[PDB]
Amino acid sequence: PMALYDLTLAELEERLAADGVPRYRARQIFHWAYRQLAVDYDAMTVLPKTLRADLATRLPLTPLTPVREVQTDDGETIKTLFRTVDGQHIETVLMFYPDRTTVCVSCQVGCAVGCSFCATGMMGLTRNLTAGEMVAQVVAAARRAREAGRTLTNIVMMGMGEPFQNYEATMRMVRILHEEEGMNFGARRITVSTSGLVPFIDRLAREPFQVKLAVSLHAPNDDLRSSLVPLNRRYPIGELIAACRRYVGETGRRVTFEYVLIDGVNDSDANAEELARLLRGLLCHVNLIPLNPTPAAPFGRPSVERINRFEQILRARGIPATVRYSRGVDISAACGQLRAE
Numbered sequence: 001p002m003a004l005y006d007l008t009l010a011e012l013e014e015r016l017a018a019d020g021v022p023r024y025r026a027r028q029i030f031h032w033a034y035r036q037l038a039v040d041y042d043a044m045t046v047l048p049k050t051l052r053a054d055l056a057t058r059l060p061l062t063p064l065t066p067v068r069e070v071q072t073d074d075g076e077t078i079k080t081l082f083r084t085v086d087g088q089h090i091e092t093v094l095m096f097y098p099d100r101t102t103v104c105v106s107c108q109v110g111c112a113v114g115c116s117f118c119a120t121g122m123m124g125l126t127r128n129l130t131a132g133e134m135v136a137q138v139v140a141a142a143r144r145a146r147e148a149g150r151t152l153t154n155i156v157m158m159g160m161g162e163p164f165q166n167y168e169a170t171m172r173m174v175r176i177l178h179e180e181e182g183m184n185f186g187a188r189r190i191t192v193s194t195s196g197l198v199p200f201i202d203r204l205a206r207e208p209f210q211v212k213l214a215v216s217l218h219a220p221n222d223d224l225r226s227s228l229v230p231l232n233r234r235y236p237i238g239e240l241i242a243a244c245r246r247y248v249g250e251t252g253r254r255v256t257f258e259y260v261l262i263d264g265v266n267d268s269d270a271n272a273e274e275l276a277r278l279l280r281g282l283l284c285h286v287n288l289i290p291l292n293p294t295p296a297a298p299f300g301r302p303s304v305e306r307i308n309r310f311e312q313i314l315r316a317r318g319i320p321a322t323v324r325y326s327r328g329v330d331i332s333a334a335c336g337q338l339r340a341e
């Protein structure tokens with residue numbers, strides 16, 4: 001079971017040739033699927049009708065069915081629910097900014113890591129998504145952006161799931177989107193975020209694609225971090241930071257750290273000072289994310305005054321840091337809120 005979106009251009013050429021179809025048809029299919037954002041094969045008028053039928057039967061265009069869309073009152077954040085072929089659901093979020101248009105993509109149905117503040121983790125892991133199911137979210141978002149006068153410019157792997165527990169499929173998505181005859185999507189426009197699977201940071205450092213790396217940290221010591229991120233028991237904070245230092249050494253590229261701020265948990269002045277010591281000298285940037293509400297929510301968000309003080313401490317120690325209030329809270333589309341209904 002493959003969809004069109006699972007294949008590189010070369011793989012599609014070889015699949016067509018095995019069926020006696022000219023290899024040149026592969027570039028035409030990529031043009032119509034990715035530049036024209038075709039909704040179905042019958043939209044690809046350049047292809048013979050019989051070939052459109054063979055493709056529809058043997059190589060379905062997309063593996064996702066859109067079910068529902070909701071947007072914020074200002075229309076700048078749009079969340080879509082999709083159904084998979086096996087009857088599961090995932091969500092995507094499309095964000096309109098002044099100078100860019102970004103899709104937040106899911107990489108798994110659920111998540112196995114179980115971070116204590118994340119609603120996705122509360123559902124557990126159903127299965128990894130295929131590369132085609134990730135590409136499908138990007139194509140749908142690019143089509144929706146075009147309706148708003150926009151071209152999709154950026155992708156963030158910050159929806160449901162842990163990308164480094166689905167590493168091969170995530171990198172296949174990057175490769176397919178990079179195809180010049182398809183979406184022609186530069187790797188620098190894609191951010192991959194991880195809760196901190198050390199060996200895959202080392203692997204990412206050696207990939208030919210210059211994706212941006214984000215690491216979800218949330219605490220500056222092991223005792224605290226393990227209470228929030230169960231993966232820290234397996235890949236502890238010292239090993240995680242060492243891997244980030246090696247990544248910068250190999251690539252010369254900045255690491256972005258995410259730090260969710262939680263009232264009375266990880267938001268003290270002493271926590272900020274310890275974080276600055278932990279990150280000393282590293283080429284990095286810290287995004288401070290005030291906790292978003294979830295149904296369970298034993299935890300709360302700190303005051304504005306506490307959030308601003310934490311940011312002030314980091315900056316004073318030479319660590320670039322920005323508070324980022326998530327978009328889409330009013331439609332349950334913010335970081336940590338995706339439950340797929």
Ligand SMILES: Nc1ncnc2c1ncn2[C@@H]1O[C@H](CSCC[C@H](N)C(=O)O)[C@@H](O)[C@H]1O
Nearest residue numbers: 118158161162193194195216258292335336
């Ligand atoms: N309730 C919540 N409020 C704010 N951010 C949250 C949140 N729940 C999870 N997040 C954050 O949402 C981001 C993307 S989660 C998806 C990517 C990856 N699994 C990761 O953890 O990095 C992470 O930085 C995560 O810690």
Ligand code: SF4
Nearest residue numbers: 111113115118121195
């Ligand atoms: S924060 Fe990231 S790793 Fe943690 S449970 Fe949510 S999706 Fe999974």
Ligand SMILES: [Br-]
Nearest residue numbers: 021022048051
């Ligand atoms: Br043909």
